[PDB]
Write a protein that binds this ligand. Sequence first.
Ligand SMILES: COc1cc(C)c(CNC[C@@H](NC(=O)c2cc(C)on2)c2ccc(C#CCO)cc2)cc1C
Ligand SMILES: COc1cc(C)c(CNC[C@@H](NC(=O)c2cc(C)on2)c2ccc(C#CCO)cc2)cc1C
Lengths: 454, 449
Amino acid sequence: SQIKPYRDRFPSHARLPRAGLPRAEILAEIAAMGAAESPAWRDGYASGAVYHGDEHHIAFLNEVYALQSQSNPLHPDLWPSTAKFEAEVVAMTAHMLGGDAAGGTVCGTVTSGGTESLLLAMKTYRDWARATKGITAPEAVVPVSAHAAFDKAAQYFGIKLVRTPLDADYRADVAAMREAITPNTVVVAGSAPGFPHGVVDPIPEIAALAAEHGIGCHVDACLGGFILPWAERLGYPVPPFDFRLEGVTSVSADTHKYGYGAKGTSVILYRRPDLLHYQYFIAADWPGGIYASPTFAGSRPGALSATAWAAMLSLGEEGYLDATRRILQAADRLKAGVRAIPSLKILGDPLWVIAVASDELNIYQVMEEMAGRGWRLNGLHRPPAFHVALTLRHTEPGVVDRFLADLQDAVAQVRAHPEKATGMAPVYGMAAAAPPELVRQVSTGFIDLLYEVH
Amino acid sequence: PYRDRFPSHARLPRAGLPRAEILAEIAAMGAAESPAWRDGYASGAVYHGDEHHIAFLNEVYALQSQSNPLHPDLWPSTAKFEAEVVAMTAHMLGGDAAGGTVCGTVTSGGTESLLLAMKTYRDWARATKGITAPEAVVPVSAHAAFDKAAQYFGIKLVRTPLDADYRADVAAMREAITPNTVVVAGSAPGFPHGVVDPIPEIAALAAEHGIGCHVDACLGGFILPWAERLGYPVPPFDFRLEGVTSVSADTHKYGYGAKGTSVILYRRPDLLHYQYFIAADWPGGIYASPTFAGSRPGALSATAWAAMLSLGEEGYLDATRRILQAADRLKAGVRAIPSLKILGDPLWVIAVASDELNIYQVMEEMAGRGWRLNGLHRPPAFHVALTLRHTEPGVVDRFLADLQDAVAQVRAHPEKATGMAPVYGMAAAAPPELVRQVSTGFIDLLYEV
Ligand SMILES: COc1cc(C)c(CNC[C@@H](NC(=O)c2cc(C)on2)c2ccc(C#CCO)cc2)cc1C
Ligand SMILES: COc1cc(C)c(CNC[C@@H](NC(=O)c2cc(C)on2)c2ccc(C#CCO)cc2)cc1C
């Protein structure tokens, strides 16, 4: 119920006021909530959530939004600027992701986020495989670690999703993937890296598996697309993961993540225009005129595409290199510190999204102790663990040292009381062992709580 | 047109470009593009457009720019804004008449509200009626998004004909209903001709068959309640009708919020719960989605909340009065040009057609004078969706003078077909496979560097 802390701070609104409220009063309330909320992400207490977070970069993008606020890309005749920004965002991302190696046929679109990029990629493989291979019962083979949006795509578009086991390094077991391929498989996927444990899947081998079966290979680089090319140039071990690989037929990369654009954008890329074409929706007989959508949406907030273009141009190759170096050096420091705490262990060998578990202590209480110190960490299960996705906010002076000091104490306090399960720890413990319908019932109730007006 | 005016960026620059330089380029494009919508030349596209209202919303955006409602623990401000936008919208659309069970979510736009409602009806029907081959019945005039939904979620869409008033023929909708029908829909109003369908009749049809009734009020949700209070004739179209099970309404249209938001409402929580996505076995943790997206631009929900609050009932009533008064004056003027006809009897989205002349040439003559109108087909026509931008001094008078000149020019030369007029003509005559081909090339053209 700390998800509803303004219940007794600001007046609630279940109905429109009769008279319009003063603009200065609306602004005062919003700024007051900003004063309460901003320190958590600004001062480096949030895992992921805010990727850049510098006040001058934010002020720069807020100005870009302001200049382009009326932009709706559904009307390129009215906003040709925005069509230019989206075309250039896609062209620049494709090039960064080995697009020239594919022969200059790499194309794509700007989306509302990573989820849309993954859903669109799944719908496209389903539609392409039906029209060209005649598959009417589509299947998709992905590792267990692959994004929850794959499950969302399966249920929405009627694709059978086959999730395959991981190895001891929390990487996709490719042999398990090969064994799951049937004549109905439309796509195989790999994560670069996956969200739970920040490990990069063996993409060259996943791409070669797809190529030999004549199926799609989607690379989910939503998290790593804007990190991994720079990590490669810096001396860090990163296998080829993009269009440089022959079997790779699509890549998703989030401009609103490490691209450092404003929330609300991502990029979906395909190796060829013939694949891209299956993503489009075209209505030819509607009295409202000829209608064509490249993505899920009709009307779109064009100003957010402009923030993505403005962010990429302001950073350039050097900015992205320098941002990755900072993130990866902060990650190296954090990994070394965690590995020096006796009761903790890191899952796999990640470069910057660090999952921490314990064979000795209840990691959910260790996590709860951190929450008690203001840390906002992602809680994981299968296995129980928490993770920290390092951002530019965690590269600021003293943030990693503050995390390490607070983790040292958290472990000590749980080592003294291993029975302690306070706050959110029993919920996470319950959740990890709960049957799916109990999880479904509790999640439905949590979403309903978010929409409560009192 | 910026091809040679501004340098093209097909690759990231080696070194970052100065922030001031990027802003100067974006502002340059802004100065060239803003007059079209600001001076009232664009049909729909920009719904409010006043400099001070825009400046207020841009400041609301700046204060909430980091907001991501995927994290309500970090941004409880946005979860509150989304709850209150839904509550206020539900109340405005007769939600009280349902005893307090009306609930919903904020979406990215009108398309997502329509897509979400179609998937909810599909999932609800499979779960409770055992329907595995779902169908949906809509008038031919219902948004193209119903076809996107049908194709995405594997629902058979059955489009039914209109009557002489361009309103849905409900007798035809009844004849399309099979035991596999999960939902029927009506528009309030439809986009093509701006006419409200017979929602009472459609909602009665749905209730009688135990199926859902979706009302597409994306365009009219923030106009119609206020049109009613003003004494204008409007068929009841919302939760006042027992048969209506869901309503969609766009806050980013006549709600005057910034682009990127809409609302989907359902009559009951049991219905809404079929919209939600829940993953229970993912190592990334328990994952729940109220809509299609994961991360979302929470700042756009804040602009919707801020707009609704700054206007209130009086603000919406004043905005609707101005738009309806501009529409009355525009419709009267059109009716004083006998070569033209209005399709149906719309309140503010006016479609104009001609039996005597080539309407696509009349449209071309208006485009020459700066007008940005929507070209329609089945039948050939154009439309004007009136906004607060057309309520400004002399915009409708300018429109009617340009329209009188456009008609005199086409009457002088019935054979004239210039600019975009042969394109529209060709496209209205074209087989669907050629329409698909040209539109694909058009999208490829938009992403060309
Ligand atoms: C085959 O040749 C043609 C191809 C096209 C597309 C046109 C123009 N038709 C207007 C249409 N635009 C788009 O589909 C669109 C998508 C993107 C991106 O840019 N434009 C549109 C846009 C919005 C509504 C609407 C609405 C209520 O929500 C209706 C129609 C003309 C000809 C002759
Ligand atoms: C009652 O059982 C539970 C139910 C929930 C939902 C939680 C929280 N789990 C974190 C989860 N959040 C959400 O699903 C969510 C949606 C909205 C709105 O608010 N939260 C999340 C969010 C994002 C990623 C990700 C990613 C890469 O894209 C992963 C997990 C905990 C327990 C024990």
